[PDB]
Design a protein around this nucleic acid. Structure first.
Ligand code: MG
Ligand code: ZN
Lengths: 191, 197, 52, 158
RNA sequence: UUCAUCUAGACAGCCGGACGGUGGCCAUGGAAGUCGGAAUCCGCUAAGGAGUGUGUAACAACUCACCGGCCGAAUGAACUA
């Protein structure tokens, strides 16, 4: 159909500055700086009133106008990451063998170590992506918490931790052992 | 559809200008059963029209043409509000409406309003039922051939929803940590709305 | 044993899924079409069989 | 005191099921066959028809005195000889109920019946009659429901 | 293409309710809405099916049709090539 104009709004809170060169977005907020390259989407950014950015697609097809809302969501998540942050809480689930999760250093790289998963003698190592902070949560049993500006990096770290603990050669409906994302929210409460 | 809506609006008209003392009551969290009970109590005293905010609002705005007195009602038509029309004594009708406060039991995954505790008393349920206490880590022992909680234990706490097991044991031992009932917020009467009482 | 809440959490990822009848792909529980190209994105999906 | 309000569903004029009464009442010091006997004697009005007996557990006392249940009452008002499932089960229950009997049932239930008027109580009684697929004064329950809400056979609501 | 819903608030989304008569009747050792046959009813009703599923040995219990609270403009279904 080639819709003439499609537009999306990106609200910018007070403490956030968005610098948009051709398609390189730099969002700066209280929690830090996030950067994203969007030169693969062919959209147009325009600053309206220093609190609102419009992103537009001109003469766009269905896939193009869907990518427009995808871009709006990506930039909104960048702004959310620099204002509130992103935190994923994962639970260790096991029937018999307690999963031992720790933080170790290998040439200054901050791996997450998983031992005794389903009794395996193998040691699973998941590198911590830069910008992601790991905290083992008290007051809740067997909880790991991943916090950071980029929801992409936080969720990818959580996904790596979850996928490294997949059960092989067993009925996974019965062997539910693993490390599963239990909650996805923001670092700052109720913001 | 439009036919039924027009019928509803006509019923609204007659209810309004025959039963001036209507009660804007809050049906939020009120069960259908409790509604039926309170209605049966007020039978022959108070009719309870309980349509959707939007249609009631539009209808009363239209009726303003002949009965402008009801404009103040419109800003109050928000949330789950039901108009209990009547003319019988205000105090008595309101008391019957807002006196039944049924103890709502622990439905699964229901937000806990307080720090509900389970008490070191002889519950009396059959030995078999000890499984729930075991699952919830409730310290108990069979006394007089029945389950008896040895020590006080907080089962649920403020915040976290009441998980299926939590709710199951709570319902089993009859702790009902909720309370639902017809809650009047305002009362229009003799062409005047005012605080619920 | 696994406590009910953690068991339900694990089941959300292991058991509460759809399966394509043509290509057996593990699909989201609310999916209407398969995501795989081999099966032609068919709408022939079933719930993943529950243990016991 | 012991005011336990526990009850069951033993068939009319029938011994309360031994299997049912082994884990429920038997524990509460009440012989299952004794419960069956008292249930039968109470349910003589409900002969052959399942009806809750509202056995009031008042300090080791089986309280056979039945609570009339609308559907069971309709099956009784059928006035068909007590259902003899022993001779050919899948018994036929049509039992033309003169509407007077339905009104009597409604009078006996109004106390509890949510039915706002004596009309409404009779109305739901006849709905249960249609559920049991009987006939009332040689006319389909649904159609006499139409007539009773239309204004020919009215009900003297108290 | 055709038929539908919709500013007298469309669909989706989050939360509340989802009763009473009623374990409706029957086949079954037991089957209460939900392994099965028939009957496809109403009172309260904005609304509730003698029942959309999960679950029970049967219960009980969650679940959905149905109606609501919030947001506010287009949306849904079956088809054609
Ligand atoms: Mg094997
Ligand atoms: Zn497939």
């Amino acid at each position: 159909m080639k819709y003439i104009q499609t537009e999306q709004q990106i609200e910018v809170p007070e403490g956030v500055t968005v610098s948009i060169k051709s398609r390189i977005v730099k969002v700066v907020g209280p929690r830090g700086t996030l950067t994203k390259n969007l030169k693969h989407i062919d959209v147009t950014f325009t600053k309206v009133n220093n609190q609102l950015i419009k992103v537009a697609v001109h003469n766009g097809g269905r896939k193009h106008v869907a990518a427009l809302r995808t871009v709006k969501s990506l930039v909104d998540n960048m702004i959310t990451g620099v204002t509130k942050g992103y935190k994923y809480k994962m639970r260790y689930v096991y029937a018999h063998f307690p999963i031992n999760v720790n933080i170790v250093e290998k040439d200054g790289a901050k791996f997450i170590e998983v031992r005794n998963f389903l009794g395996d003698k193998k040691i699973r190592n998941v590198p911590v992506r830069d910008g992601v902070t790991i905290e083992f949560s008290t007051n809740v049993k067997d909880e790991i918490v991943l916090s950071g500006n980029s929801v992409e990096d936080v969720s990818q770290n959580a996904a790596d931790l979850q996928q490294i603990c997949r059960v092989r050669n067993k009925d996974i409906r019965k062997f539910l052992d693993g490390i599963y994302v239990s909650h996805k929210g923001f670092i700052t409460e109720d913001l | 559809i439009r036919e039924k809506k027009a019928e509803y609006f006509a019923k609204l008209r007659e209810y309004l200008e025959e039963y001036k003392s209507l009660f804007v009551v809050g049906v939020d969290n009120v069960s259908s059963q409790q509604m039926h009970e309170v209605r049966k109590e007020l039978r022959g005293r108070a009719v309870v029209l309980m349509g959707k905010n939007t249609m009631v609002r539009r209808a009363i705005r239209g009726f303003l043409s002949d009965l402008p007195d009801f404009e103040k009602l419109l800003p109050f038509v928000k949330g789950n509000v039901g108009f209990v029309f009547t003319n019988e004594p205000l105090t008595e009708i309101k008391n019957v409406i807002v006196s039944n406060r049924v103890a709502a039991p622990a439905r699964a995954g229901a937000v806990a309003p307080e720090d509900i505790w389970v008490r070191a008393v002889n519950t009396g349920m059959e030995p078999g039922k000890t499984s729930f206490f075991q699952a919830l880590g409730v310290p108990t022992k069979i006394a007089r051939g029945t389950i008896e909680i040895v020590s006080d234990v907080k089962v649920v706490d403020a915040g976290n929803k009441v998980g299926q097991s939590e709710a199951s044991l709570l319902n089993l031992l009859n702790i009902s940590p909720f309370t639902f009932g017809l809650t009047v917020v305002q009362v229009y009467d003799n062409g005047q709305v005012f605080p619920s009482s | 044993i696994i406590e009910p809440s953690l068991k339900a959490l694990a089941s959300k990822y292991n058991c509460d899924k759809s399966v394509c009848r043509k290509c057996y792909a593990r699909l989201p529980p609310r999916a209407t079409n398969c995501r795989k190209r081999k099966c032609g994105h068919t709408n022939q999906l079933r719930p993943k069989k529950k243990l016991k | 005191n012991e005011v336990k309000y526990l009850y069951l569903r033993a068939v009319g004029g029938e011994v309360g099921a031994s299997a049912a009464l082994a884990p429920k009442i038997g524990p509460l010091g009440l012989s299952p066959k004794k419960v069956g006997e008292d249930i039968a004697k109470a349910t003589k009005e409900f002969k052959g028809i399942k009806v809750t007996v509202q056995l009031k557990i008042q300090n080791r006392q089986a309280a056979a005195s039945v609570v009339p249940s609308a559907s069971s009452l309709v099956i009784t008002a059928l006035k068909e000889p007590p259902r003899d499932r022993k001779k050919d089960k899948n018994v036929k229950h049509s039992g033309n109920i003169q509407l007077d009997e339905i009104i009597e049932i409604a009078r006996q239930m109004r106390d509890k019946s949510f039915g706002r008027t004596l009309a409404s109580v009779t109305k739901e009684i006849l709905g249960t009659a249609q559920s049991v697929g009987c006939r009332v004064d040689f006319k389909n329950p649904h159609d006499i429901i139409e007539g009773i809400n239309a204004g020919e056979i009215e009900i003297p609501e108290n």
